[PDB]
Amino acid sequence: PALPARATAVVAPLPEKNYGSLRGGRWPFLYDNVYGLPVVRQVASYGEVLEGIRTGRISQVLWFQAPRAVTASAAAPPPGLGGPQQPQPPPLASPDGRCLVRFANGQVKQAVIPPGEPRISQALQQYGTAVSYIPLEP
Amino acid sequence: SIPTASKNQIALIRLNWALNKTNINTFTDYSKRNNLWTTQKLRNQSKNN
């Protein structure tokens, strides 16, 4: 069982960027710290995603999710009436509207889209670009 | 899973609902539905008075 890398160095933070949609981009490392996965560095605008959908250059969109606290569920009498406990409410879409967009050429970017927006909703439906939700981490 | 006063209140609520569910609430001495079928007996005993 080979022990993994253990290095250290001094690096200069990257210049902060403001693409309009999101701000930041001061991370000079190709991976993340607590996890071992690559961080994205290219972001999309509103019109960019809209046109990628209209022309078909986007294949599938994925949303993040939220826990949906139990008190806000109407599938049984409320907890406080004393009934047997219900398993769990299904999770909501992203309240803040983060999404990972997947292109026809293997590129994956990040964007912010509010769920239920007027134009994107109609474009998704007309062009059938795949939609899905990213499950929650343990 | 829930405190005591809760379950006491819910027992009282169930008591009230159960008492309502017995379909006896409408019967009163002074209805007309009770005066129309009881005129025969009262007539009989009043003429036999």
Side-chain angles (χ1 to χ4, degrees):
Chain A
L3 202 283
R6 203 179 58 76
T8 295
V10 290
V11 187
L14 310 192
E16 189 146 7
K17 292 159 296 299
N18 195 316
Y19 298 106
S21 267
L22 301 132
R23 77 159 26 226
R26 287 175 67 229
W27 201 241
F29 301 91
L30 194 128
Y31 300 84
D32 82 88
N33 316 346
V34 83
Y35 278 93
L37 296 85
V39 306
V40 202
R41 286 190 325 127
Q42 44 273 40
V43 307
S45 99
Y46 183 76
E48 302 186 330
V49 192
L50 187 42
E51 264 317 300
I53 275 190
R54 272 186 194 156
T55 77
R57 289 186 191 189
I58 305 182
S59 40
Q60 171 202 60
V61 192
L62 317 177
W63 308 84
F64 294 84
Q65 286 176 75
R68 189 187 253 150
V70 61
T71 34
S73 81
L81 303 201
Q85 172 166 166
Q86 298 303 114
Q88 202 62 22
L92 305 143
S94 34
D96 43 35
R98 306 288 225 138
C99 48
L100 299 171
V101 51
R102 218 211 66 187
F103 290 79
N105 45 13
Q107 304 268 296
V108 67
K109 296 184 186 176
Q110 65 169 134
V112 60
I113 307 171
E117 206 264 354
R119 277 291 177 181
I120 310 298
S121 300
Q122 308 183 34
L124 282 166
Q125 276 188 25
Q126 293 309 311
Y127 296 88
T129 286
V131 184
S132 156
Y133 297 76
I134 295 161
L136 280 169
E137 56 187 87
Chain B
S1 311
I2 45 150
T4 84
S6 77
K7 295 193 52 189
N8 286 69
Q9 227 176 356
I10 314 173
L12 302 158
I13 290 170
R14 179 197 62 224
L15 155 59
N16 276 275
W17 177 83
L19 175 50
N20 162 250
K21 236 45 194 179
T22 62
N23 284 320
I24 54 176
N25 74 331
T26 173
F27 172 73
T28 91
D29 274 38
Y30 330 95
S31 144
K32 301 297 196 295
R33 193 194 280 241
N34 209 64
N35 281 20
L36 286 208
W37 267 272
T38 46
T39 166
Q40 326 309 329
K41 181 228 65 58
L42 190 272
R43 163 208 186 281
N44 181 94
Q45 276 140 33
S46 95
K47 280 158 183 175
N48 286 21
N49 179 0

